[PDB]
Design an enzyme around this catalytic site. Structure first.
Site, short mmCIF file in Angstrom:
data_model
loop_
_atom_site.label_atom_id
_atom_site.label_comp_id
_atom_site.label_asym_id
_atom_site.label_seq_id
_atom_site.Cartn_x
_atom_site.Cartn_y
_atom_site.Cartn_z
N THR A 106 9.47 -14.92 7.76
CA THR A 106 9.20 -13.45 7.64
C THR A 106 8.66 -13.11 6.25
O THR A 106 9.23 -13.53 5.23
CB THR A 106 10.47 -12.60 7.91
OG1 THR A 106 11.01 -12.92 9.20
CG2 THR A 106 10.15 -11.09 7.85
N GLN A 107 7.55 -12.37 6.21
CA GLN A 107 6.97 -11.85 4.97
C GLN A 107 6.58 -10.37 5.20
O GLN A 107 7.09 -9.72 6.11
CB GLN A 107 5.74 -12.68 4.52
CG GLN A 107 5.74 -14.18 4.85
CD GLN A 107 4.89 -14.52 6.06
OE1 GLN A 107 4.93 -13.83 7.09
NE2 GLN A 107 4.10 -15.58 5.95
N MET A 114 9.17 -18.22 13.23
CA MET A 114 9.46 -16.96 12.50
C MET A 114 8.79 -16.86 11.12
O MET A 114 9.32 -16.23 10.20
CB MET A 114 10.98 -16.73 12.41
CG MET A 114 11.65 -16.50 13.76
SD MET A 114 11.10 -14.99 14.60
CE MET A 114 11.86 -13.73 13.58
#
Ligand SMILES: *[C@@H](CS(C)(=O)=O)[C@H](Cc1ccc(CN)cc1)NC(=O)[C@H](CO)NC(=O)[C@H](CC(C)C)NC(=O)[C@H](Cc1ccccc1)N=[N+]=[N-]
Ligand SMILES: [Mg+2]
Ligand SMILES: [Mg+2]
Ligand SMILES: [Mg+2]
Ligand SMILES: [Mg+2]
Ligand SMILES: [Mg+2]
Lengths: 204, 244, 241, 243, 228, 196, 240, 219
Positions: free
Chosen positions: E1-2, E107
């Site tokens: 996740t970013q 993810m």
């Protein structure tokens, strides 16, 4: 759910003239419920005494762990561990669990058998050594103990006088704490005799 | 590849013997003799130091007799360095048992685990076995006083009296001759020293070539004391029995 | 006799693979020499290019390990380049971890420690090389430290390596008996290079063109090699005296 | 003795006999060459036509690394492919971290260190190839030759395989007769001639010629195979010189 | 996740009788700040494929390197690298689609929406979309992000169904694309005047046009606006 | 922080203020945000001091090891190593780095690397919290192929304004000049720049 | 590369001998003489600096190493093997002792740790034993002064005085005559210099001899380990 | 805690207070906060006390091994690197805030190290809860190249500012003066507060406490 105040309890140590004292209460509870009035918090490994307050499972675990470690020490070193050395071992062992600590407040007390010098020390849960000439306090009534010791304590007390001072420090501190008390034990420690006394105190 | 240089330390001979175990036992037969004698009120451990020099520091020395805990000791015959690896493992194992059960480890349990370690080096891993034979002397509240021995094979057995190292054949005959079941510690002390004195490859048995220990209940009431003898105490016990 | 194939002891307490690695050292048939000035450390080595089809600029046994440290190798080039890449990596890591430039003697000890491991561990052969490290250390000054396949290392006032090393060594010993000092008492590195070449000429009994030699020079804050024309300039100066 | 039975063992001379034995496998292979020129390099190789049944032009032996490097080798062909596969990985990881395509000397040491590593342990076998390779980088043209020991140098011209001595002699004449330099298009023609001349040492089976090149002006600094009109012109030049 | 930091806006495209057209503006936004004014977001692969990318620019540059590396790798041991075994639009797309879906499934997505436009070996038009979720689809017109809302409605009036593709010339298709880019410049707050356009035709090959500008801008009606 | 790098005729100049803060406390008023990764490749640091310091140290190590093997790295190569660290560790980094260097072939070059780890080659670059206030000014006043004195004035005037409006910027204006001649360090104090 | 030497290279032979240990001991025999003597108020250790070349700077090569402030070591046998044991000895004194107990290990326990490392090279896969014998001298508060020998097997013994390497048989006899329990440290240094002169062929001076002591504290404590200077040795050689 | 350091003409002067606290309670009034790294390098410590002690001890141990191997005195830059790189790796969770000061072959150096792994190289620094009080004194009176007794007085004055004005700081003032020719570890340098005198004797007489049982055991 604050691990250091689930079970309750206190420990205090003092120095005197060629002697040391270490005392503890006997309560073990589960928050409001008193469960045991026989739970001693002071242990010894040869002539070095260790008191432990905080989460009772960790008190028991650490006693067992330091017994293990001081037994192996004595076998390899061919001599009993001294208070200054043991203090360092306690610090190392606690800091090994830096990000998942034992929830404890240990107190070292004893007389160095070579030099004859009385020695006490205290630690936070994470291993930071607190050395003192006078007194070390620990547990759920530590504030109360700090106040009692700071006003009652004087230097170079004889063993019999020091007993009265440390006992009055513990008793009056315990009676201002809901989670401490239910009985008390005092250890008076001289160069080659140790006297263990149980105190009469209020049982509420 | 490296197959060329593999001795194959964990194989059988055509006769069904383990080469390396047999050769390790041959090594141990040249080590200084160690004797264990179990009496009704205690145990004696006696061992002969390997040919001493006059400039060896005798008092601050340990070669043959090692403390495992307050209730158990061992006499060593073989490579000392190999023995120390095993001794430390045994010392730790005792403390694990004490930490787990809050009781001192029963002697056989400790002996079995040490012997099981030795066995492993003969079945897997391609390493040489430990060139060590132990005499275990100890006390527990189940069997009281116990003597055991183990050897590089990992086989162990219990004894009333036993010898390891050099001249065991002669030593065992002599022990078998003078040992009896109602014996006391002070008699066993004398038997141990007399046996070493006759089997020794030296000219005469002296204080400086011996290590000595007793495990008695001769403390004060129902508890066990380990006495690793000082040089002067060996000198006195050697005079008291009239060997010197 | 498999005690001669791997690094285990023979009955006389010897390691034949280490001894034979020392013999691989001379396989190139090249002689090197190192000396110290006041301000500098000079290393010189013979350059033999037998094949006409070789690019002579790529034929080298002197390596710039770091900005300050130079290393000349006596031995086959594959092992030489293996040693060089490791030394470079080690000196870069040291500077990152410890915040200052790896000293010549510390690198020498490190490479000697690696060499030692190959003399004790069976799966790794020793490298058939002798490594001579040179610098002007900021604490110890002009420095020469040398490593071999045994894992031995020591500092030097001056040194030589190769098939005809003993001739060069005694030549240097005889000069330092005479001068009574630990180094070449000279201001400029140019003249210390001239001394090095002069005493190599005397000891080996051969003359050199510009393409027969290879020169490394260490000063404060840099080690550098000389071009064919830098050496030629240096050869002219010797001839005109 | 027995010193020659295990890789990485020093003989009492200070030699690794297993590497020397790998060199024998290389000497047995077909002839391959490299010619350095004005602004680039040219590679050529002898392909023995074992049978009529081999499809012409369709068993390609010269290999590209990145977009600017060409590799050719003599000896155990699979061993050469293993080396190029590693070369391709090394070149990719250089370009990934440093952005610029791998310089030729840098690439040479990557192969060198890898080949040298296969002389350090008895659990591996040395490479059974000598590899001629090169290309164009920021500093101009470079030609290299790498041997089973890990030894490599820069070259004006290089040759290996069964006809290496014949080819070397022919290469030495070019270096002497052209001190200023050889052009890329000239070097292609000369490469053809030298392979035909070096074929005298392998003349039972007739052969197929394969040439490639990198040149700053002629191929824009990229590796390309020589095909069609330029190949047939180079073949005809070579045919004229043998007669 | 970013989270996406530096970003590109719409990529738009359509099919026509002989090939495909694709276009995208040259802006790299940093939130509301119009930070970088010279960013190329159409990246050609060979002479038959153009990959148009929107979303995170750092992730676009990563994808650009993967494609550049794909061309190198295809050339290895491939004598027909410039002929029968050259990279096809369908190959390049499937690779990216595989990557995009793998990355979302760990993810750690590549924060982009991509359109692969090209022409195949047999002359067939290729036009297909893929995004950070690994979702794929094809249509006679395709557009990413903002362009899906404004460009597609205009482009679909030229090619509403499959049967309209043979009826649409390259001139009509290019006009529509350039017209759509003007509409996006009026209405998209994170767009710019300067853009690139690429035509991939089965006959005339790859034509790549740089430094185009939106022109014929209607602003005159603005003077007659007085208050709210 | 207010940092910038500007290409000009003879090479490139880097500029920075000297203020580091924890909230509104100035922890260091004399900070050096211009750091050497190679002889003539330098960077301006913005974002987390700890992150940018750790990155710059790793890059300096990488380029030292590059130099040992392949000689002097290009400015592009240095920027690529910064990018690789910033991009692959984007989730754990707060670093806005401008990379500036002098080649003899390529002359002066500026690469900016914002938070995402994208790379952008530009004639000049501005970054840090104070840069917002000078976009208008810098775009209006930058010209290509300026002289050394003009570029020093352009940076001095620009950072002067960035400092004036940004509370996170201040102290001295440090500059580093990168040319064929070598490396020059310049400092300008408040009493000069404030009254521009 | 697979490290496929997962098996012992030291094994028991039919006679019960461990060949590689014996052969390591032969390597120790070939090495230069070193000795150690224990006094009442100190310990001395000594050896010859056998210079490989006169161009070599023998000051850089330290045969006598500080392990802790109160413990020193000297060897006979293979120098590189010694160097790595000193590195591990220094490190183990910190990791497994000082970082735990906040003090340096006593001599006997540091010896025990070195002995362990040497034993493992005698049993582990794909390694030869160490080709060195060590002499470790030291002081600690509860044991006082002590001197230990450590062999390739991993076996260690405490000594009043001893020698190892080349001329050890002759040197041990010389020490047996001279040694008593009332020796001062200066008397022990005098005896060390006399004993070492026998085994040395060539030059005998402060530049060719390396000699260190464990003695009084040199100004928490000061270090008891002190390496004697070239001048300090030469002064005692005039009263020889 | 108030810790501080300055670079003076001949070297470095470090300073620290002596109060150790457990929340709002003072656990130790005379606690040592200036730590030994090497003979020529010392380290003042603020933040989490266990983290400070264990981080300086570990780096002091590793520098001792480094110095034995290289045979030369360690540098401040290596002490700085080893602390820095470790603290960075633990992303601030090791709450060590150090003032690192010492004297090298390259001269005197002073650093401030933060928990997240950032360092500043400076002629004067202050850390801990009393840093602002101490920094005010340095901004008021600091100049470069001070004499020894002047620099001593400035640091002492800066620690005092922290003692009196910050509640987290208190007790005595400890100094550490480091130069090429000497190391002066001054503990205590100043006792700015007398211990409060008690007017009554509250100690109980013998037999006053009520005992249940007793047991004596000899050793
Ligand atoms: C002042 C730093 S400050 C208040 O400005 O942040 C001192 C610095 C210091 C004192 C002593 C030493 C010893 N060599 C080194 C540095 N710091 C303190 O007084 C801290 C206050 O944050 N005190 C502690 O860390 C105490 C140690 C006391 C027993 C003496 N420990 C605690 O307070 C622990 C901290 C803790 C850690 C992990 C998780 C939870 C809590 N509390 N408890 N329990
Ligand atoms: Mg109560
Ligand atoms: Mg109650
Ligand atoms: Mg080997
Ligand atoms: Mg401002
Ligand atoms: Mg971070």
């Amino acid at each position: 759910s604050d691990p250091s105040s689930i079970n309750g309890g206190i420990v205090v140590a003092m120095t005197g003239k060629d002697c040391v004292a270490i005392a503890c209460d006997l309560r073990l509870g589960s928050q409001s419920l008193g469960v045991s009035n026989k739970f001693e918090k002071i242990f010894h490994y040869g002539h070095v005494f260790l008191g432990i307050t905080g989460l009772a499972t960790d008190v028991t675990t650490l006693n067992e762990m330091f017994r293990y470690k001081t037994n192996l020490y004595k076998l390899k070193e061919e001599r009993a561990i001294e208070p200054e050395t043991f203090t360092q071992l306690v610090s190392s062992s606690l800091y090994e669990r830096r990000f998942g600590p034992y929830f404890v407040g240990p107190v070292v007390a004893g007389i160095n058998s070579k030099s004859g010098k009385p020695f006490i020390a205290g630690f936070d849960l994470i291993g930071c050594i607190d050395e003192a000439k006078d007194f070390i306090v620990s547990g759920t009534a530590s504030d109360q103990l700090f106040g009692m010791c700071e006003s009652l304590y004087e230097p170079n007390l004889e063993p019999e006088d020091l007993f009265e001072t440390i006992s009055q420090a513990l008793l009056n501190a315990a009676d201002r704490d809901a989670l401490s008390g239910w009985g008390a034990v005092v250890y008076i420690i001289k160069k080659d005799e140790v006297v263990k006394r149980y105190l009469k105190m209020r049982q509420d | 590849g490296s197959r060329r240089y593999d001795s194959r330390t964990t194989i059988f001979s055509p006769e069904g013997r383990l080469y390396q175990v047999e050769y390790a036992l041959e090594s141990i037969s040249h080590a200084g003799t160690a004797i264990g004698i179990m009496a009704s009120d205690g145990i004696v451990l006696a061992a002969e130091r390997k040919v001493t020099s006059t400039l060896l520091e005798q008092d601050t020395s340990t070669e043959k007799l090692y403390k495992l805990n307050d209730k158990i000791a061992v006499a060593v015959a073989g490579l000392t360095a190999d023995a120390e690896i095993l001794i430390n493992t045994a010392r730790i194992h005792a403390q694990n048992y004490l930490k787990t059960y809050n009781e001192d480890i029963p002697v056989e349990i400790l002996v079995r685990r040490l012997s099981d370690i030795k066995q492993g080096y003969t079945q897997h891993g391609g390493l040489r076995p430990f060139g060590v034979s132990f005499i275990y002397a100890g006390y527990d509240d189940r069997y009281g006083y116990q003597l055991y021995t183990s050897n590089p094979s990992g086989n162990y057995t219990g004894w009333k009296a036993i010898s390891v190292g050099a001249n065991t054949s002669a030593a065992q005959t002599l022990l078998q001759m003078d040992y009896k079941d109602d014996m006391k510690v002070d008699d066993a002390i004398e038997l141990a020293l007399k046996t070493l004195s006759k089997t020794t490859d030296s000219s005469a048995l002296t204080y400086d070539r011996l290590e000595f220990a007793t495990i008695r209940k001769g403390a004060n009431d129902g508890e066990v004391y380990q006495k690793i003898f000082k040089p002067q105490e060996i000198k006195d016990i050697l005079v008291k029995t009239g060997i010197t | 006799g498999y005690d001669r194939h791997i690094t285990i002891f023979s009955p006389e307490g010897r390691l034949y693979q280490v001894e034979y690695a020392f013999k691989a050292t001379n396989q190139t048939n090249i002689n090197s020499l190192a000396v110290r000035g006041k301000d500098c450390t000079v290393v010189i080595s013979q350059k033999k290019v037998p094949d006409k089809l070789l690019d002579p600029t790529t034929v080298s046994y002197i390596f710039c390990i770091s900005r300050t440290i130079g290393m000349v190798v006596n031995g086959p080039i594959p092992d030489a380049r293996n040693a060089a890449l490791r030394a470079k990596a080690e000196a870069a890591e040291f500077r990152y971890k410890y915040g200052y430039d790896m000293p010549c003697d510390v690198l020498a000890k490190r490479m000697a420690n690696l060499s030692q491991i190959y003399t004790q561990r069976a799966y790794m052969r020793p490298l058939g090389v002798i490594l001579t490290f040179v610098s002007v250390d900021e604490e110890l000054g002009p420095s020469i430290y040398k490593t071999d396949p045994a894992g031995y290392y020591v500092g030097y006032k001056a040194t030589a390596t190769g098939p005809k090393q003993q001739e060069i060594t005694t030549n240097l010993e005889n000069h330092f008996k005479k001068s009574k000092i630990d180094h070449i008492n000279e201001e400029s590195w140019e003249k210390v290079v001239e001394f090095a070449i002069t005493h190599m000429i005397d000891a080996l009994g051969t003359e050199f063109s510009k393409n027969d030699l290879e020169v490394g020079v260490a000063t404060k804050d840099k080690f550098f090699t000389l071009s064919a024309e830098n050496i030629e300039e240096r050869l002219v100066a010797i001839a005109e005296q | 003795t027995g010193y020659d039975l295990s890789n990485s063992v020093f003989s009492p001379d200070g030699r690794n006999f297993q590497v020397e034995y790998a060199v024998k496998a290389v000497e047995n292979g077909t002839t391959s060459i490299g010619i350095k020129c004005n602004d680039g390099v040219v590679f050529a190789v002898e392909k023995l036509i074992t049978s009529k049944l081999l499809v012409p032009q369709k068993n390609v032996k010269i290999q590209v690394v990145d977009r600017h490097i060409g590799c050719v080798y003599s000896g155990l062909i699979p061993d050469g492919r293993h080396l190029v596969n590693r070369g391709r990985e090394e070149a990719a990881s250089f370009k990934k971290l440093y952005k610029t395509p791998i310089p030729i000397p840098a690439f040479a040491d990557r192969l060198g260190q890898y080949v040298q590593a296969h002389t350090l342990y008895n659990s591996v076998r040395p490479f059974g190839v000598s590899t001629i390779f090169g290309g164009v980088d920021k500093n101009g043209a470079h030609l290299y030759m790498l041997e089973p020991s890990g030894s490599y140098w820069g070259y004006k011209g290089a040759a290996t395989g069964k006809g290496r001595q014949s080819a070397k002699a022919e290469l030495e004449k070019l270096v002497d007769h052209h001190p200023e330099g050889l052009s890329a298009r000239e070097a292609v023609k000369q490469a053809a001639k030298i392979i035909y001349l070096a074929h005298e040492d392998n003349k039972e089976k007739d052969f197929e010629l394969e040439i490639s090149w990198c040149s700053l002006s002629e191929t824009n600094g990229l590796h390309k195979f020589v095909k069609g009109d330029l190949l047939q012109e180079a073949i005809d030049f070579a045919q004229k010189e043998i007669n | 996740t970013q989270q996406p930091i530096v970003t590109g806006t719409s990529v738009i495209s359509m099919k026509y009788d002989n090939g495909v057209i694709i276009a995208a503006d040259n802006l790299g936004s940093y939130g509301s700040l119009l930070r970088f004014n010279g960013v190329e977001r159409l990246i050609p692969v060979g002479d038959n494929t153009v990959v148009g990318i929107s979303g995170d620019i750092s992730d676009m540059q990563h994808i650009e390197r993967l494609l550049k590396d794909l061309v190198t790798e295809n050339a290895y041991d491939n004598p027909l690298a410039d002929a029968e075994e050259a990279l096809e639009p369908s190959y390049i797309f499937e690779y990216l689609a595989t990557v995009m879906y793998q990355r979302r499934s760990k993810m750690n997505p590549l924060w982009n929406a991509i359109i692969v436009a090209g022409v195949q070996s047999n002359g067939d038009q290729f036009l297909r979309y893929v995004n950070l979720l690994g979702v794929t689809y094809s249509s006679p017109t395709l557009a990413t992000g903002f362009g899906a809302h404004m460009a597609n409605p205009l482009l679909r009036k030229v090619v509403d169904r499959e049967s309209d593709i043979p009826k649409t010339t390259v001139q009509v298709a290019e006009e529509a694309i350039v017209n759509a880019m003007r509409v996006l410049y009026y209405r998209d707050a994170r767009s710019s005047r300067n853009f690139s356009l690429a035509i991939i035709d089965k006959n005339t090959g790859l034509t790549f046009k740089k430094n185009l500008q939106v022109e014929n801008m209607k602003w005159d009606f603005a003077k007659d606006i007085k208050g709210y | 922080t207010s940092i910038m790098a500007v290409t000009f005729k003879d090479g490139v100049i880097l500029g920075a203020d000297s203020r580091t803060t924890t909230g509104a406390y100035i922890a260091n008023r004399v900070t050096d945000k211009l750091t050497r990764v190679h002889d003539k490749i330098w960077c301006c640091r913005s974002g987390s001091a700890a992150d940018t310091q750790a990155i710059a140290d790793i890059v300096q190590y990488h380029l030292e090891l590059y130099t040992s093997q392949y000689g002097t790295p290009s400015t592009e190569t240095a920027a690529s190593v910064f990018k690789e660290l910033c991009y692959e560790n984007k989730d754990n980094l707060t670093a806005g780095i401008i990379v500036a260097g002098y080649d003899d072939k390529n002359k002066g070059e500026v690469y900016t690397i914002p938070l995402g780890g994208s790379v952008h080659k530009l004639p000049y670059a501005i970054a840090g919290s104070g840069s917002t206030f000078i976009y208008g000014y810098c775009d209006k006043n930058f010209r290509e192929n300026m002289s050394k004195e003009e570029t020093v004035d352009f940076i001095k005037h620009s950072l002067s304004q960035a400092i004036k409006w940004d509370g996170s910027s201040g102290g001295v204006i440090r500059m580093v000049v990168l040319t064929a001649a070598g490396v020059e360090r310049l400092i300008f104090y408040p009493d000069e720049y404030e009254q521009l | 590369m697979t490290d496929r030497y997962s098996f012992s290279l030291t094994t028991f032979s039919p006679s019960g001998k461990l060949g590689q240990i014996d052969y390591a001991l032969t390597a120790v025999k070939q090495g230069v003489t070193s000795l150690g003597i224990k006094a009442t108020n100190g310990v001395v250790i000594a050896t010859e600096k056998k210079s490989s070349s006169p161009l070599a700077m023998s000051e850089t090569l330290s045969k006598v190493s500080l392990l802790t402030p109160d413990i020193g070591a000297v060897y006979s046998g293979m120098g590189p093997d010694y160097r790595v044991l000193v590195d591990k000895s220094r490190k183990v004194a910190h990791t497994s002792y000082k970082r735990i107990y906040g003090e340096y290990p006593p001599t006997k326990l540091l010896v025990s740790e070195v002995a362990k490392i040497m034993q493992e090279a005698t049993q582990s896969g794909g390694v030869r034993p160490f080709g060195v014998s060590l002499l470790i001298a030291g002081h600690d508060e509860f044991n006082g002064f002590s001197l230990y020998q450590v062999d390739p097997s991993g076996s260690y013994f405490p000594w009043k005085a001893t020698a190892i390497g080349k001329g050890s048989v002759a040197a041990k006899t010389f020490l047996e005559k001279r040694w008593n329990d009332e020796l001062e440290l200066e008397d022990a240094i005098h005896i060390a210099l006399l004993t070492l002169k026998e085994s040395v062929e060539g030059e005998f001076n402060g530049d060719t001899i390396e000699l260190a002591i464990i003695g009084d504290e040199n100004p928490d404590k000061g270090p008891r380990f002190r390496k004697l200077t070239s001048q300090e040795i030469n002064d005692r050689l005039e009263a020889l | 805690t108030t810790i501080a350091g300055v670079v003076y003409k001949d070297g470095i002067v470090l300073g620290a207070d002596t109060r150790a606290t457990e929340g709002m309670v003072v656990a130790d009034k005379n606690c040592s906060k200036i730590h030994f790294i090497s003979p020529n390098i010392y380290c003042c410590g603020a933040g989490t006390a266990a983290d400070t002690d264990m981080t300086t001890q570990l780096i002091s141990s590793n520098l001792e091994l480094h110095s034995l191997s290289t045979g030369r005195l360690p540098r401040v830059v290596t002490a700085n690197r080893m602390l820095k790189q470790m603290l960075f790796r633990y992303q601030g969770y090791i709450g060590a805030a150090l003032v690192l000061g010492g004297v090298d072959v390259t001269g005197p150096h002073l650093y401030s190290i933060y928990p997240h792994g950032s360092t500043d190289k400076l002629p004067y620094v202050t850390m801990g809860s009393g840093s602002l009080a101490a920094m005010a004194v340095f901004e008021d009176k600091f100049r470069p190249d001070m004499e020894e007794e002047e620099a001593k007085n400035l640091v002492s004055e800066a620690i005092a500012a922290g003692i009196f004005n910050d509640l987290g700081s208190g007790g005595n003032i400890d100094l550490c003066v480091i130069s090429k020719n000497k190391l002066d570890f001054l503990r205590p340098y100043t006792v700015p507060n007398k211990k409060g005198t008690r007017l009554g004797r509250y100690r109980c007489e013998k037999g006053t406490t009520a005992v249940l049982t007793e047991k004596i055991t000899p050793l």
